[PDB]
Paper text:
The basic helix–loop–helix PER-ARNT-SIM (bHLH-PAS) proteins BMAL1 and CLOCK heterodimerize to form the master transcription factor governing rhythmic gene expression.
To visualize how CCM binds to human BMAL1(PASB), we used crystals of this protein for X-ray diffraction studies, resulting in refined structures at 1.83-Å resolution for the ligand-free (apo) state and 2.16-Å resolution for the CCM-bound BMAL1(PASB) complex. In the apo structure, the central cavity houses three water molecules that interact with each other and residues Tyr340, His344, Tyr404, Ser436 and Asn438. Comparison of the apo and CCM-bound structures reveals overall and locally induced changes. Induced repositioning of those and other amino acids by CCM expands the volume of the resident PASB pocket three-fold.
Residue numbers in the entry: 336 to 441
Write the structure that this text describes.
């Protein structure tokens, strides 16, 4: 359904993929999120633990589940999300290119 959407994030949080279900949940067009960092939208209280879970997943092929956190939507209010993250290691270049994130409304 449309209670979740999938994003991908480069190493500074930059959105590099946003599926169209994000607009239903966040009221942003995908193009508004693409090229901006997820950290720009996290509630400032949540930056620290989300950044540490992001750092964790860069060093493992296992998935990491965040705590619930608040995400600032287009009108400036906050919704609560929980994300499941895993990193995408290129098996030839041996580089983590991005992380995959399923973002679920709580």
């Amino acid at each position: 359904g449309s209670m979740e959407y999938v994003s991908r994030h480069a190493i500074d949080g930059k959105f590099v993929f946003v599926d169209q279900r994000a607009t239903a949940i966040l009221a942003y067009l995908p193009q508004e999120l693409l090229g901006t960092s997820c950290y720009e939208y996290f509630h400032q209280d949540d930056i620290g633990h989300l950044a540490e879970c992001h750092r964790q997943v860069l060093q493992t092929r296992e998935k990491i589940t965040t705590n619930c956190y608040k995400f600032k939507i287009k009108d400036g209010s906050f919704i609560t999300l929980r994300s499941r993250w895993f990193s995408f290691m290129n098996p030839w270049t041996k580089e983590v290119e991005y992380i995959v994130s399923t973002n679920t409304v709580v």
